[PDB]
Amino acid sequence: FEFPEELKTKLQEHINYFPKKRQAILLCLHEIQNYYGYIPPESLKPLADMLELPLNHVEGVVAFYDMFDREDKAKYRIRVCVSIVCHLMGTNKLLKALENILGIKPGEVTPDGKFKIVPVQCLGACSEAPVFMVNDDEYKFESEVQLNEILSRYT
Amino acid sequence: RSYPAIPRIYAETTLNMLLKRAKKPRVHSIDEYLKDGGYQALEKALNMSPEEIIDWVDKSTLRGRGGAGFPTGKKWKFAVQNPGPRYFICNADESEPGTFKDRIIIERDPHLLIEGIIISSYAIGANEAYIYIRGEYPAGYYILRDAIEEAKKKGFLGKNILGSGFDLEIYVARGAGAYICGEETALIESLEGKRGHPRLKPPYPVQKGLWGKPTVVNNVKTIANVPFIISMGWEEYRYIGPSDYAGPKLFPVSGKVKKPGVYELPMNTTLREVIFKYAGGTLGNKKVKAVFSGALDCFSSEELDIPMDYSPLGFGGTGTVIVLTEEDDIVEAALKIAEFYEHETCGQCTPCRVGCYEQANLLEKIYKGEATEQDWEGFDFVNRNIQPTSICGLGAVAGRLIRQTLEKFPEEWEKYR
Ligand SMILES: Cc1cc2nc3c(=O)[nH]c(=O)nc-3n(C[C@H](O)[C@H](O)[C@H](O)COP(=O)(O)O)c2cc1C
Ligand code: SF4
Ligand code: FES
Ligand SMILES: [Cl-]
Ligand code: NA
Ligand code: NA
Ligand code: NA
Ligand code: NA
Ligand code: NA
């Protein structure tokens, strides 16, 4: 298993960025998930090498950080906050609209491998509860009609 | 310059300091920052000795804004008493439920933060600084990177900043979903490319920190005060607000209010004033049942007339105000707090690991109505025994809000038993 050169460039760039190269492990992992739509298990041996780090160190890191996913490939991750504030303001309304529109519940990918709903803790936007992200873009949920328009931006 | 989409968090200020620009929901770039006199405090500071800056920030009475309230001047003095090299870290993990204040300074007035970092680094003799920003803030990361490049093009970063002899580079690092990486020692661990496990203290970071070197970790807002202190002088700054807790304070208000958002106010402000005078009262004008102080504390409606300070019978915390009205099930809300601590314990300590999981497991059963009598007596037990043997503050407080909720709303819990 080898990364495309397109991708190795970005990873080298992150590795040169910090003074020591092992400090770039999270930025490399972010970049891999961004590129593949998940962290492939087979990807971790060549990463460990670029970071001059043993494999099992990288394994424990991926497992510790909740943003990283090794199970399911997904083009758009819909991160839905389930913490106290969004619960009070209508997480359940948002999840219902998502189920009506996409036909899936938290932790499921759609059968086309396009959307995965990912329940996350507070997203630091509680004034605009209930909050969700679609990859990097972030929004307040107002209604099912509104949600439907937003999701239609992601092809 | 497209950034990822961001909700436009409402912001209002009575002091016109940290929110001077950030009260408008847009990126203020360097040209607009320079027009309000930005980077002139930096210039001023570079004509004073590092020691003199330490003294000014000490005399200002600036306390940390990340929670502990530790005097920033004293922290800086402790670090400079140890031989260098020295590191400066900006804590931008902001992952506590109900807290969304640091992100608006980052996304709207990045040069306020960058200016503070440069001054602060020079004060402690640091030539390397880090901003550790949570990974669910992608937009703030990209905005910070672009702003750093701007400051560099204008000669505010690099080698020999404005002919001063000071060198500084600011590296921007991202998290990957871990609340504990906001604890300063676990942040340094994450910065070292490891898992975010809190270190035992002592030693504190100011002696042994990043690569074992003297390290100052400061919160975004603590740092954002530093340019103001340099610009106005210490004596002027210390007279802002109450003497016991001087300076601008930021209150994130959420939940059942009409005007949820971030408010810049003095700390002599009352909890009722925050909700009713500033935040537009309750939503639907329902009566207030409780205020959740983030995930740390629970105040009842009979405690709304308390100063939002760090005093006996004060509000404390990070002044985070989540409002619950009369129709809100507080044991359903207690479960939500339980579930936070369950997902966020790092696992190192046994009582924290096991107690955070079991608190959430059992309270779910109690909520769903399928808890045995042994599940009830065990919930109570688990709740009072998360703390033992823990080597950081998350274990210390994981049962705290929930315990107050049992003590202050017994009628609401009896409904479930
Ligand atoms: C579990 C936990 C989470 C924390 N999260 C944060 C955080 O998100 N931001 C922060 O500035 N401090 C946080 N702290 C406190 C820091 O460890 C530290 O006290 C602070 O960053 C020091 O900066 P200050 O002097 O500017 O307050 C947290 C502490 C604990 C125990
Ligand atoms: S108290 Fe909990 S969160 Fe803190 S170090 Fe121990 S196990 Fe980790
Ligand atoms: S509780 Fe959902 S963003 Fe804070
Ligand atoms: Cl602390
Ligand atoms: Na977010
Ligand atoms: Na709205
Ligand atoms: Na200019
Ligand atoms: Na940069
Ligand atoms: Na986090």
Three-class SS of chain B: CCCCCCCCCCEEECCCCCCCCCCCCCCCCHHHHHHCCCCHHHHHHCCCCHHHHHHHHHHCCCECCCCCCCEHHHHHHHHHCCCCCCEEEEEECCCCCCCCCHHHHHHHCHHHHHHHHHHHHHHHCCCEEEEEECCCCHHHHHHHHHHHHHHHHCCCCECCHHHCCCCEEEEEEECCCCHHHHCHHHHHHHHCCCCCCCCCCCCCCCCCCHHHCCEEEEEHHHHHCHHHHHHHCHHHHHCCCCHHHCCCEEEEEEECECCCEEEEECCCCEHHHHHHHHCCCEHHHCCEEEEEECCCEEEEHHHCCCECCCCCCCCCCCCCEEEEECCCCHHHHHHHHHHHHHHHCCCCCHHHHHHHHHHHHHHHHHHHCCCCHHHHHHHHHHHCCCCCCCCCHHHHHCCHHHHHHHHHCHHHHHCCC
Contact of B322 with A84, CB cutoff 8 Å? yes
Spatial separation of the C-alpha atoms in residues B75 and B56, rounded to whole Å: 13
* Mutual angle of helices B400-408 and B330-344, in 10-degree steps: 170
* CB contact (8 A) between residue B97 and residue A126: yes
Contact of B254 with A129, CB cutoff 8 Å? yes
Contact of A49 with A21, CB cutoff 8 Å? no
Contact of B170 with B156, CB cutoff 8 Å? no
Closest CA to B9 of B219, B250, B317, B265: B250
Closest CA to A125 of B337, B291, B7: B7
**CATH architecture, domain B247-325:** Roll (3.10)
Residues 6+ apart with CB under 8 A from B330: B289, B290, B298, B324, B405, B409, B412
B196 neighbourhood in chain A, CB within 8 Å:
64-65
At residue A31, what is the residue type? E
Spatial separation of the C-alpha atoms in residues B66 and B362, rounded to whole Å: 31
Indicate the pairing of strand B87-92 with strand B128-133. parallel
**How far is B78 from chain A, CA to nearest CA, in Å?**
25
3-state secondary structure of A66: coil
B contact residues 117-146, partner A, Cβ 8 Å cutoff? 128, 134-139
Spatial separation of the C-alpha atoms in residues B415 and B409, rounded to whole Å: 11
Please say whether the dihedral angle defined by the alpha carbons of residues B26, B28, B32 and B38, taken in this order, is positive or negative.
positive
B contact residues 168-187, partner A, Cβ 8 Å cutoff? 171, 173-179
**How far is A100 from chain B, CA to nearest CA, in Å?**
24
For residue A145, the Cα-to-chain-centroid distance in whole angstroms is: 25
From the list B94, B137, B178, the residue facing A65 with the nearest CB is B178
Spatial separation of the C-alpha atoms in residues B279 and B281, rounded to whole Å: 6
* Phi and psi torsions of A146, nearest 5°: -65, -45
Closest CA to B22 of B101, B133, B97: B101
User: Binding-site residues of A, please?
Assistant: 81, 86, 122, 126
Q: Could you tell me the residue ranges of all domains in chain B?
A: 11-238, 247-325, 330-414
CATH topology assigned to domain B11-238: Rossmann fold (3.40.50)
Residue owning the nearest CA to atom 2 of ligand 1: B183
End-to-end CA distance of chain B: 56
CA angle B70, B204, B346 (to 5 degrees): 95
For B347, the closest chain A residue by CA position comes to A64
E strands within A21-110? Answer: 76-81
Q: Is B393 exposed, middle or buried (0-12, 13-18, 19+ CB in 10 A)?
A: middle
At residue B193, what is the residue type? G
Task: Kindly report whether the peptide bond that precedes residue B50 is cis, defined as omega within 30 degrees of 0.
Answer: no
Centre of ligand 2 from the C-alpha of residue A19, in Å: 29
Number of CB atoms found within 10 A of residue B110's CB: 27
CA angle B117, B120, B123 (to 5 degrees): 150
B126 neighbourhood in chain A, CB within 8 Å:
none
Backbone angle region of B125, left / alpha / beta, with phi > 0 → left and psi within -120 to 50 → alpha: left
Spatial separation of the C-alpha atoms in residues B86 and B82, rounded to whole Å: 9
Residues 6+ apart with CB under 8 A from B321: B98, B251, B252, B253, B254, B255, B271, B274, B275, B279, B291, B293
> What strand order describes the sheet that includes A76-81?
A115-120, A76-81, A131-134, A137-140
Rg of chain A over Cα atoms, rounded to whole angstroms, equals: 17
Spatial separation of the C-alpha atoms in residues B184 and B88, rounded to whole Å: 12
User: Binding-site residues of A for [2Fe-2S] cluster, please?
Assistant: 81, 86, 122, 126
At residue B144, what is the residue type? L
Contact of B222 with B64, CB cutoff 8 Å? yes
Rg of chain B over Cα atoms, rounded to whole angstroms, equals: 22
Q: Is B377 exposed, middle or buried (0-12, 13-18, 19+ CB in 10 A)?
A: exposed
For B263, the closest chain A residue by CA position comes to A127
Contact of B160 with B118, CB cutoff 8 Å? no
Spatial separation of the C-alpha atoms in residues B324 and B327, rounded to whole Å: 8
**In this structure, which CATH number among 1.20.1560.10, 3.40.50.1820, 1.20.1440.230, 1.10.10.10 belongs to the domain B330-414?**
1.20.1440.230
**How far is A62 from chain B, CA to nearest CA, in Å?**
9
Contact of B255 with A89, CB cutoff 8 Å? yes
Number of CB atoms found within 10 A of residue B149's CB: 12
Closest CA to B337 of B295, B366, B365, B299: B295
Tokens in use for B411? Answer: 């009628």
* CB contact (8 A) between residue A128 and residue B260: yes
CB crowding B339-353: b at 16 or more within 10 Å, else e: bbbbbbbbebbebbb
3-state secondary structure of A148: helix
At residue A73, what is the residue type? K
Residues 6+ apart with CB under 8 A from A146: none
3-state secondary structure of A102: helix
Centre of ligand 7 from the C-alpha of residue B150, in Å: 10
